[PDB]
Ligand binder design. Structure first.
Ligand code: FES
Ligand SMILES: [Mg+2]
Length: 569
């Protein structure tokens, strides 16, 4: 598609956009403001870099990003350019998890994209350096870069370090699990409170291979971050050094005029996907990479993810699936060492251009390989799973697609009577009151999609409640929303069409025999197509849960999960 969104420049000029306001006499107003903010006449000749951080104080993932932003600005000035900082909003999935505040999470990606697009366009900045630090922030910044197509680099804020106390390790997942362990009797209240005080020891994104590190790693593999960006910890002095170098790299991108639509291509999108499959990355990457692909006028379907999943084995022994965390990847050569191995295996396209001004292959020629003896990244001949974790399922109940994380440890089939709930809350009340009624069932939590939720909330409490009741492998879990963790069993999200839109998931009744088949890739119902059609004629959409504000705008704008929940088409 031909993307028309933002202003064109008015060709070896480095100030292609800012010249619109710095050069003409008829933009004297603009120049007056710029003198006011501290620019000399000589400064007006230089390129202007929009430096977009997602700093805020109330989240560990984001509290350090103002300091990083200052270091990016200093490096832009050291590279002979003007650096102009601005800052957008973000939200904390870790804070808002288990609450209605989670309805505002996914849409913050799209709000972030709109924010950066807005400032870059209005202020006529020539290039962008973005400093996201948390889940949704990362793709939001890349989407903005794709829309604008101005030279850009994403500096990942970096991963949090695991907490340590009295020779035990903790992360955010320890803190989530602590409640269930207390209720079951596995730990005391004092041990519970100890976990909370030592789970998050400083700044940076959640530590394992959840969405932040998945997306950071993916975006490095896509060529839109500098080498090591995804693997250097937040509090590591090298992160600050990377910040101070971004300016030098971006200067070179302006000389080359190497733009996001030159770097983000079908092949580099594939490279990103390869990294998700190899590292055991989150199912959320499906939504985010589709959104990134659309931002540059390219197509990316659920089927494309299945093909890359089938082609690429799961190799990384990393949480949540495995043992180690993102800090351990840093110790054995970082993300470049991982990607170097995948390139040597023939799994990636080396000729894709990157933000270094060189190709992926060129970047990876000159990096140390995975440390001899390391046990984190398995060899090709002994993978953790022969294909990727990410599985696309269709069938009667998800005719437009759905996404699941499949380890290989759960078997190929599950069949059981449907147990249907109209939101998360009613599911949690039922399993609390009568846990044994869930045994052998296919649990359906519906009305939690993009429009129905609203906001397509991510839900953790259902899987942990199932685990806490001892029913992990003894029931399946289906939703039009999203789930956070694995149940050691069949857990499917992103079911399309969502129940709010009258998809078959909205027509399921209690007792319907639902059969999940992984080999066939189908979520089927024993109810006849005719009886499902009769139910469809009786069905009417429930009223929207909001009538005003940002979530009502989301309801009006958002596309399906199968289309990456894009809001601007
Ligand atoms: S709440 Fe920020 S990456 Fe988890
Ligand atoms: Mg999340």
């Amino acid at each position: 598609q031909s993307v028309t969104a933002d202003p064109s420049p008015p060709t070896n000029k480095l100030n292609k956009y800012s010249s619109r306001i710095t050069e003409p006499k008829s933009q004297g107003g603009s120049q007056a403001i710029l003198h006011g903010v501290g620019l000399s006449d000589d400064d007006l000749l230089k390129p202007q870099i929009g430096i977009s951080s997602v700093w805020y104080e109330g989240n560990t993932c984001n509290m350090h990003l103002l300091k990083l932003s200052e270091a990016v600005k200093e490096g832009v000035e050291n590279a002979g350019m003007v650096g102009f900082r601005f800052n957008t909003i973000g939200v904390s999935d870790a804070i808002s998890m288990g609450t209605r505040g989670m309805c505002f999470s996914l849409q913050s990606r799209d709000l972030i994209a709109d924010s950066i697009e807005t400032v870059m366009s209005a202020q006529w900045y020539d290039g962008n350096i973005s400093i996201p630090g948390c889940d949704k922030n990362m793709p939001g910044t890349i989407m903005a870069m794709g829309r604008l197509n101005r030279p850009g680099i994403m500096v990942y804020g970096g991963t949090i370090k695991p907490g340590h106390f009295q020779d035990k390790t903790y992360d955010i997942v320890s803190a989530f699990q602590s409640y269930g362990e207390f209720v079951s009797g596995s730990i005391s209240d004092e041990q519970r409170k100890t976990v909370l005080h030592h789970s998050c020891p400083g700044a940076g994104a959640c530590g394992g291979m959840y969405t932040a590190n998945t997306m950071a790693s993916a975006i490095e593999a896509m060529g839109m971050s500098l080498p090591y960006s995804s693997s250097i910890p937040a509090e590591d002095p090298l992160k600050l050094d990377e910040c101070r170098l971004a300016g030098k790299y971006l200067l070179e991108l302006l000389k080359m005029d190497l733009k996001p639509r030159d770097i983000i291509t079908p092949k580099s999108l594939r490279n990103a996907m390869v990294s998700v499959m190899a590292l055991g990355g989150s199912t959320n990457a499906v939504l985010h990479l589709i959104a990134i692909a659309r931002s540059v006028g390219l197509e990316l379907t659920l089927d494309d993810f299945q093909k890359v999943s089938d082609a690429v084995p799961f190799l990384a022994d990393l949480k949540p699936s495995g043992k180690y965390v993102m800090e351990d990847i840093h110790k054995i050569g970082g993300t470049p060492a991982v990607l170097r191995y995948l390139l040597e295996l023939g799994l990636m396209d080396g000729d894709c251009m990157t933000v270094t001004g060189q190709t992926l292959a060129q970047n990876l020629e000159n990096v140390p390989s995975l440390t001899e003896g390391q046990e984190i990244i398995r060899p090709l001949s002994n993978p953790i799973k022969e294909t990727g974790h990410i599985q696309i399922l269709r069938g009667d109940l998800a005719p437009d697609g759905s996404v699941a994380k499949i380890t290989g440890k759960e078997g190929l089939y599950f069949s059981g009577p449907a147990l249907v709930f109209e939101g998360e809350e009613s599911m949690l009340a039922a399993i609390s009151a009568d846990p044994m009624s869930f045994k052998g069932t296919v649990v359906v939590i519906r009305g939690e999609g993009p429009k129905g939720g609203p906001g397509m909330p991510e839900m953790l409490t259902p899987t942990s409640a199932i685990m806490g009741a001892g029913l992990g492998k003894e029931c399946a879990l289906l939703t039009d929303g999203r789930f956070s963790g694995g149940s050691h069993g069949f857990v499917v999200g992103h079911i399309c069409p969502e129940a709010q839109e009258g998809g078959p998931i909205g027509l399921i009744k209690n007792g319907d025999i639902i059969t999940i088949d992984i080999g066939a890739a189908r979520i089927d119902t024993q109810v006849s197509p005719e009886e499902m059609n009769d139910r469809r004629k009786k069905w009417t959409a429930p009223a929207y849960k909001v009538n005003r504000g940002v979530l009502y705008k989301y309801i009006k704008n958002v596309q399906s999960a199968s289309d990456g929940c894009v809001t601007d088409e």
